[PDB]
Design a protein around this ligand. Sequence first.
Ligand SMILES: *[C@@H]1O[C@H](CO)[C@@H](O[C@@H]2O[C@H](CO)[C@@H](O)[C@H](O)[C@H]2NC(C)=O)[C@H](O)[C@H]1NC(C)=O
Ligand SMILES: *[C@@H]1O[C@H](CO)[C@@H](O[C@@H]2O[C@H](CO)[C@@H](O)[C@H](O)[C@H]2NC(C)=O)[C@H](O)[C@H]1NC(C)=O
Ligand SMILES: *[C@@H]1O[C@H](CO)[C@@H](O[C@@H]2O[C@H](CO)[C@@H](O)[C@H](O)[C@H]2NC(C)=O)[C@H](O)[C@H]1NC(C)=O
Ligand SMILES: *[C@@H]1O[C@H](CO)[C@@H](O)[C@H](O)[C@H]1NC(C)=O
Ligand SMILES: *[C@@H]1O[C@H](CO)[C@@H](O)[C@H](O)[C@H]1NC(C)=O
Ligand SMILES: *[C@@H]1O[C@H](CO)[C@@H](O)[C@H](O)[C@H]1NC(C)=O
Lengths: 457, 457, 457
Amino acid sequence: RAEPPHCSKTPIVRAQTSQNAMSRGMQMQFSIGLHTAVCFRLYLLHTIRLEKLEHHHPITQRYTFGIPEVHASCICECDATSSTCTAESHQFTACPESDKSDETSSCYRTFFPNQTPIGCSEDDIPKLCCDVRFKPYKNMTFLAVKLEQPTTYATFVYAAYDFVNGYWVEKDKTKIRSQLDGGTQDRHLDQKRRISLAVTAGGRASHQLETGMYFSRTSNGGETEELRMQPLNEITDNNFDRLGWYRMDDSGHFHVNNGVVKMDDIHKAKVKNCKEQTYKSILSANHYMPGHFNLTRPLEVIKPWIQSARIFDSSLRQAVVTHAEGTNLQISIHLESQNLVFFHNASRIRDFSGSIIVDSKSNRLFNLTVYEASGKIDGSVKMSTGFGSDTIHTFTAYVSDLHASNRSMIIPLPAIVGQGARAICLRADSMADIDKICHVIEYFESPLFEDDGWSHP
Amino acid sequence: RAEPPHCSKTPIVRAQTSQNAMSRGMQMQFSIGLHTAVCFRLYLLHTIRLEKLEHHHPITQRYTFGIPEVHASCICECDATSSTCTAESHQFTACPESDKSDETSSCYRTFFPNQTPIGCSEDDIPKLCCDVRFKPYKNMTFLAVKLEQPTTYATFVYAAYDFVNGYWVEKDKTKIRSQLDGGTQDRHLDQKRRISLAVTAGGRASHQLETGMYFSRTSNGGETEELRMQPLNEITDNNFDRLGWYRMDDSGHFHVNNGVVKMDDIHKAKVKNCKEQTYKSILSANHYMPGHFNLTRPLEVIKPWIQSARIFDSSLRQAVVTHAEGTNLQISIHLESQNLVFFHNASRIRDFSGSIIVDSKSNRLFNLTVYEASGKIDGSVKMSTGFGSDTIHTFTAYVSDLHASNRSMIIPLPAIVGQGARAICLRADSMADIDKICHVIEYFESPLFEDDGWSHP
Amino acid sequence: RAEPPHCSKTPIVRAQTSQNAMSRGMQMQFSIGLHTAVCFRLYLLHTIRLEKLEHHHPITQRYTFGIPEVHASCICECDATSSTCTAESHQFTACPESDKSDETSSCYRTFFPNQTPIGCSEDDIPKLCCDVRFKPYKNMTFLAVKLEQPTTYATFVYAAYDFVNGYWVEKDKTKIRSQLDGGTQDRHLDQKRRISLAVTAGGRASHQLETGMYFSRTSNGGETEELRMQPLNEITDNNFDRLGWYRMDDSGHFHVNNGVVKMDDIHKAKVKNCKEQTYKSILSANHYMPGHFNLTRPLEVIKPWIQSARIFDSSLRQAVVTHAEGTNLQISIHLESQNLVFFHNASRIRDFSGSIIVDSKSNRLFNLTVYEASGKIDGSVKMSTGFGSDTIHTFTAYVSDLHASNRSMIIPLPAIVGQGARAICLRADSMADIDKICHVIEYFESPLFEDDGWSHP
Ligand SMILES: *[C@@H]1O[C@H](CO)[C@@H](O[C@@H]2O[C@H](CO)[C@@H](O)[C@H](O)[C@H]2NC(C)=O)[C@H](O)[C@H]1NC(C)=O
Ligand SMILES: *[C@@H]1O[C@H](CO)[C@@H](O[C@@H]2O[C@H](CO)[C@@H](O)[C@H](O)[C@H]2NC(C)=O)[C@H](O)[C@H]1NC(C)=O
Ligand SMILES: *[C@@H]1O[C@H](CO)[C@@H](O[C@@H]2O[C@H](CO)[C@@H](O)[C@H](O)[C@H]2NC(C)=O)[C@H](O)[C@H]1NC(C)=O
Ligand SMILES: *[C@@H]1O[C@H](CO)[C@@H](O)[C@H](O)[C@H]1NC(C)=O
Ligand SMILES: *[C@@H]1O[C@H](CO)[C@@H](O)[C@H](O)[C@H]1NC(C)=O
Ligand SMILES: *[C@@H]1O[C@H](CO)[C@@H](O)[C@H](O)[C@H]1NC(C)=O
């Protein structure tokens, strides 16, 4: 049932190997695009597909955090000399064992002297004492990870096909992994060890996830899911305006990172009426419940170049970022006297549909859907709705399926492709200019979505 | 009046296209440098110039800020039990409507009990109450933007020239835009749709503006100008040591981001004499007036690789960074039996002038000015003032004008080209070594320029 | 005594130069790997070695810091109206000249009223006054530097060898420096100015040190050593959780950056017993002594791609980062009718040894040591301990020595090469598959090493 991939139209360069003071060897060179295949015969169809481009980021930091659910409760004393409510009992201290404590809860104390005698005698200088309690919100736990500069790997699929009877028969299928950060990587590619595959990257990948703090939900069983990015603290940092200040210890117990010491800086309270036991209370912090947390969607949902961004396995040592968009790699195929012949299939497209989108994260793109398409498809973006209007941008899209297929794809657009409807014309490689499919594509701009008082008694 | 560009000396690689099970096609391959042109005839002179290399960064955050002009005014009460000056009236509160308010001003209160009875009786425990007022300084408004990982575009200029009579005649002129982050981008380049242009980048651009917070002045009419970089807060951050804590709301009203809550942390005051109504007051913050703000020059002025860095248009969705310095792109020109012949013009230079500069931002460079020059010019930096001294560095500069022209350019230098005068010799491509112009170039090192108490009653 | 380097097996591409309207020139093109050499004869053996790949980062910020040794001493007054211990004497003030001061020490005051009358009468409201002293710990001084976006330089070694009698004789040896960030860099390479060397990078280097704050120890004589990275403040930042808040002025005197103003925010104290003069005291800060500092090892020790990362010289303007791992560069050698012939030497390996390591910083690698090896060595990593088990990864290693030599090297591994022992098979370029050396390599995973209360009277 196995069929070959679309054999891409590629220019080949004849390279001649250097000579040694013994016994010349010819090599075939070409650039291979990400998600494309190259086919050749040897004088059994051999196919090389660039399946994956990945960044393997070492995880240099790890801590477990949650979203705190905060409740503060205060008591006022009208008389500043009262034995009740003191810096001894409420300043730089956790709530006592005697103070009604839930197992999952963490409780820190605050002390506010120099209150106004509302509810007291004119000469009283009240003091307000508080318990600030933190609970894990909806038992939502997250793993915080520092991702550093990655190593780059390309995964190729080598498949060999024989055309026995009237159907294609898959004879060989192997996955070839090659490191991209250094020099040329070489290996044998066929079962007979006759054909060799050399891979060479020209510099860094066009994209990379920036060194920094990322995180994912931790679940029952398969702990980690897709990584996300939201302002988050490094292990040694304790900025209450960022995620991660509500940390989990060796046991599954959450605490406010340096809570006892920091509480007086974050919790701010003032009396309303001392007698009536009423007050104003706030938490000069971010990412807590109620009303101070909104979880960002994963990286792969919000960033078009990211196909996937996940922690590799349960050892939590590497984060693997799989690329949706990436530049070509340089390939060199070397091997009695034999002939290596490269083959490609024709490109087709029946029709297309789409919309020009400017998403809530400012990504300018053409959401393209092709119909009964395969191969290299050249697109041209026009100045207006008229098909004959000036070309403002040109691009090429590549369809993977050997048979004509219906597929969706994101084409990034330059800032010149501004507001309003315009024509986009698509033509398959080596088809008359008359054989182009033009359409008026509608424009959809989502407004920029971005983030950013006192509670009673 | 239109004349062609200098046709660059380029090596060409014969590539042969793969074959399909129908009906071989030859391609011409070469590397094109940024700001260079390549010329060819078809068997009407066709020219391809790599005009621009650009990064289109999506703008993921936006807020408007200004520079606050701060004035604090305090009143002291000798008696701690006085109805005047309390935590009710001055702690965690904006100044009242009754408290003399300018429309453009924002006013926050501070409360300082436990003062020393200087100006009172020995047993008094004074309290100091303050109004901390903020005004926009010189009505200077700025837009803060978060720039994320860009998409890359090359702009080429294709021009066709006929030599009718005794003058060059420009027959065709189009701008070709090509995306660099993915695979090979292809399009038709001539009016007759006979010639095709494939563009391929080998990885990321040698330069990129780092993901982060940038900003520009906002003006009357054409809102935004050149982008700048200075320590600046992300929308969800509120670090008083960085720009952006003085924000503008829906109306043109500026406020201290979380002012009511944060004032007691930033404003610090102490009595001098309670009776005399004198005090010490400071703002533990940065980027305010008087004496705490110094505006950084734009990115393109301070960073030699940046030609321009601007917000694209009034929709404020993309920032366009135009590159002054960038690596070459791989080009492949494909098409009865016709012959494609590449042509170049000779390189010349009459003389040169310059100085070796180490600017206030530590950029080590040769400020080069060429005279009656055109094309490829090879430079060599020497160990001493002697022309015959050891070569310590070699470089190539490219002059765009078809006719010999006078032009200025920045050549970056490695750390080996340290202090003191030295010889620099310049030779145009394919000129005798005798035909080199040597000069003793003077060295100019600017010291590193970098940034970083109590006011009375 | 000088011997040539191992001449690498390289494929050559015939390029033809464009033509001018005067009097064609053939060029030889190939990719050169970092730490490899290419040899050719001219119709005296000419060798080109890519010796170094370097980033020259401009230093945009500089300040000198140390590690503070903190001691706090407090005195309590039972009576809040006492002339002794006031906001005048202890709030927002350095310790007086009269207050026993060491020349190297810096002393800041804190004031804590509203204490509990432990050791006093029931109606007393004690006040606690402190001196917080800072000393340089072990006179350890560091230089903090901001490293910005670098310029890239390749250093080549051109050597010419004659084989006179029975020994190799080194006739010429020069170091060629070439900038990588822009277009093709060209120069003459032989003494006779007959051979030219053009160098072209395809994009940015596969690695780069991220723009940010770095630092090194400052010593007697040769001031700076290897750079390090640990959370560190920018010159305008003053985050007490990061390094650099303990700064050195024009003279060799250390101070707490904005100490007078910030002390009340960082130093937190509470009375134990007023009469007994006992208290609790802490410093809500990081990177101080005792017990709050642990120095990170240099970048080159912890990051496998970094060979060296140092400040260039005493002017402190550039940081040079030398790369251990980097992608290939494109080379083009151009020149009566003469013939250019490229030569390579055979590849050999007697045996190998190693271990698969996952270090304390999450780097996954094969610590490879080769025996009597030279040239291109192809490696294959297996699924299990069995030599015939499925290949999970393939790589190529390059040995520099012309003679068979014993050398250690780090091969990075993809996340697929998880826990447990497995076979690794090594084969030299153009040796039978039978001529491979397989070994069962043991796995060593170091746990992730990462960083992150009250003192008595
Ligand atoms: C795609 O390309 C291949 C190679 O050009 C096509 O041809 C098959 O393979 C060899 C030629 O290399 C022939 O001997 C076979 O007879 C071909 N198979 C068939 C089914 O004709 C292949 O057919 C192409 N596939 C499509 C879908 O067009
Ligand atoms: C630069 O290069 C072109 C091409 O080599 C020069 O030649 C012109 O173009 C064709 C050759 O391709 C000739 O038929 C024309 O007669 C040439 N024009 C002239 C003015 O002679 C062109 O002249 C060169 N320009 C300069 C300034 O040297
Ligand atoms: C490595 O390569 C060179 C070139 O192939 C070897 O050959 C020497 O150089 C020329 C050929 O270019 C001969 O005329 C010399 O006679 C060769 N020298 C010797 C010692 O035979 C060179 O020998 C090789 N080195 C090794 C260690 O194998
Ligand atoms: C593109 O449109 C298709 C429907 O035609 C939809 O499934 C897909 O999610 C859209 N993608 C984006 C990024 O809007
Ligand atoms: C280079 O010198 C010219 C004058 O010769 C001047 O216009 C230019 O601004 C200088 N550039 C720098 C970066 O110093
Ligand atoms: C690799 O092993 C050798 C000893 O065989 C040792 O000298 C070297 O430091 C090791 N390197 C690492 C990174 O473990």
